Enzyme design. Sequence first.
Site, mmCIF file in Angstrom:
data_model
loop_
_atom_site.group_PDB
_atom_site.id
_atom_site.type_symbol
_atom_site.label_atom_id
_atom_site.label_comp_id
_atom_site.label_asym_id
_atom_site.label_seq_id
_atom_site.Cartn_x
_atom_site.Cartn_y
_atom_site.Cartn_z
ATOM 1 N N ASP A 92 72.396 80.884 87.444
ATOM 2 C CA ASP A 92 71.627 80.944 86.199
ATOM 3 C C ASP A 92 71.922 82.181 85.372
ATOM 4 O O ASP A 92 71.551 83.286 85.745
ATOM 5 C CB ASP A 92 70.131 80.851 86.474
ATOM 6 C CG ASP A 92 69.325 80.727 85.184
ATOM 7 O OD1 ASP A 92 69.940 80.519 84.104
ATOM 8 O OD2 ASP A 92 68.109 80.863 85.226
ATOM 9 N N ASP A 127 71.736 80.098 78.746
ATOM 10 C CA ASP A 127 70.963 79.921 79.986
ATOM 11 C C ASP A 127 71.401 78.683 80.744
ATOM 12 O O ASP A 127 71.115 77.571 80.324
ATOM 13 C CB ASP A 127 69.523 79.758 79.559
ATOM 14 C CG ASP A 127 68.595 79.669 80.705
ATOM 15 O OD1 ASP A 127 68.577 78.585 81.329
ATOM 16 O OD2 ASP A 127 67.858 80.656 80.934
HETATM 17 N N1 LIG Z 1 60.043 71.819 82.644
HETATM 18 C C1 LIG Z 1 60.729 72.664 83.035
HETATM 19 C C2 LIG Z 1 61.573 73.667 83.541
HETATM 20 C C3 LIG Z 1 62.911 73.745 83.187
HETATM 21 C C4 LIG Z 1 63.682 74.768 83.721
HETATM 22 C C5 LIG Z 1 63.111 75.674 84.606
HETATM 23 C C6 LIG Z 1 63.916 76.786 85.180
HETATM 24 O O1 LIG Z 1 64.283 77.468 83.984
HETATM 25 C C7 LIG Z 1 65.066 78.532 84.180
HETATM 26 O O2 LIG Z 1 65.403 78.943 85.275
HETATM 27 C C8 LIG Z 1 65.534 79.169 82.894
HETATM 28 C C9 LIG Z 1 64.481 79.628 81.903
HETATM 29 C C10 LIG Z 1 64.268 81.074 82.248
HETATM 30 C C11 LIG Z 1 65.462 81.596 83.008
HETATM 31 N N2 LIG Z 1 66.282 80.387 83.286
HETATM 32 C C12 LIG Z 1 63.000 81.174 83.063
HETATM 33 O O3 LIG Z 1 62.833 80.653 84.158
HETATM 34 N N3 LIG Z 1 62.094 81.918 82.355
HETATM 35 C C13 LIG Z 1 62.688 82.384 81.183
HETATM 36 C C14 LIG Z 1 62.151 83.206 80.224
HETATM 37 C C15 LIG Z 1 62.947 83.543 79.150
HETATM 38 C C16 LIG Z 1 64.251 83.079 79.058
HETATM 39 C C17 LIG Z 1 64.774 82.242 80.022
HETATM 40 C C18 LIG Z 1 63.959 81.912 81.084
HETATM 41 C C19 LIG Z 1 61.783 75.576 84.952
HETATM 42 C C20 LIG Z 1 61.017 74.566 84.420
#
Ligand SMILES: N#Cc1ccc(COC(=O)[C@H]2C[C@]3(CN2)C(=O)Nc2ccccc23)cc1
EC number: 3.4.23.46
Length: 394
Positions: free
Chosen positions: A224, A34
């Site tokens: 992403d 990720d």
């Molecule tokens: N404190 C904080 C903080 C850090 C990063 C972010 C942004 O994190 C992302 O974009 C990552 C994580 C991700 C997909 N990519 C998602 O958003 N939900 C999810 C669910 C399952 C797998 C991956 C994911 C937002 C907030």
Amino acid sequence: FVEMVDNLRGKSGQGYYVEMTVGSPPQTLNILVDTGSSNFAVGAAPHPFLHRYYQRQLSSTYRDLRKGVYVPYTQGKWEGELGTDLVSIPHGPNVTVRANIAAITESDKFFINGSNWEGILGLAYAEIARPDDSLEPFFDSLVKQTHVPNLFSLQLCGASEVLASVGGSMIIGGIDHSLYTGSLWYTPIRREWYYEVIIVRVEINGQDLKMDCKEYNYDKSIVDSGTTNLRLPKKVFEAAVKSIKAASSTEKFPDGFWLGEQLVCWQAGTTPWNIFPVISLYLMGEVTNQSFRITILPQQYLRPVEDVATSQDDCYKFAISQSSTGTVMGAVIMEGFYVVFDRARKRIGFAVSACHVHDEFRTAAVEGPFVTLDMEDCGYNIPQTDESRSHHHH
Ligand SMILES: N#Cc1ccc(COC(=O)[C@H]2C[C@]3(CN2)C(=O)Nc2ccccc23)cc1
Ligand SMILES: [Zn+2]
């Protein structure tokens, strides 16, 4: 880089993951790759959706940091205990790294039933690490403890009782020229927190959406791998869908189709690809006033799902969706391109993926340069809250 080729797996729309071992003796875990985050974290207690999890107490090399961590995403949420331990990638560099690890003890809408991954490898920068930017992310530690070049590259390869298996490659430490064709074009990383980039122009089948380019990057644009869809800010999404609806209009699908919530099917092998337009995103060049375009096909943004109940049909999901936190170039984008995360020179390269899905009439394309006189600024500046402002950075 042959031994890293094809080192990713998963199920379509559910994340690509790489195998890693943590601890001594090594515990193997499948970890979501990720680039939209910066924490390394693994399920560390039982969970309906987990086959296995990390057992801190069965590792002689584990050190508890006696510090808790909480990361809420919006779609997601997890927490755990901070620690370090020895970590390696079996189908990666021949090295072992001591890295921070979050042992996840509770979670919500984080883990995905059927995905086959048990943690997440956050490959973005320390700025968005939790609980703060003093938690050294995995990649930083790897580069710092070994001789690994400060760069990694991703080739994500797109696809009845199960979703389709996907394959990918993560090359840690460089660029495998067998993974792409043609030119590799680079766009500057705007800031080093997310892999933030700047889009200067969007076209749907040659047709300019003609929005203020700041709308493309409101409130940011990021690459992403851990996001399935191409996600677009509301205004942009509505304009894009309108144009796509219009090119594809000999076919009248249900609302649920365009909202990414419903399959549409054709008799096997008869999908009229050619009624669906290509989408081109123009990215800021390394040279001022220059841009290049990455151009994807409906074969990237139309995501195959085999209907149990009409398995004689080719069925598809629309994998462009709405965003309220900016443009996300997710797997849908990435699966057209070999993508080079050049942290050393603070840039992201795109080239055409040797494994992207296409037809005899069209392929995904990376093309440049394009030139704008007195190009405006398409970057947006996120309002600074008092919370964020009050943080010191020592
Ligand atoms: N404190 C904080 C903080 C850090 C990063 C972010 C942004 O994190 C992302 O974009 C990552 C994580 C991700 C997909 N990519 C998602 O958003 N939900 C999810 C669910 C399952 C797998 C991956 C994911 C937002 C907030
Ligand atoms: Zn201070």
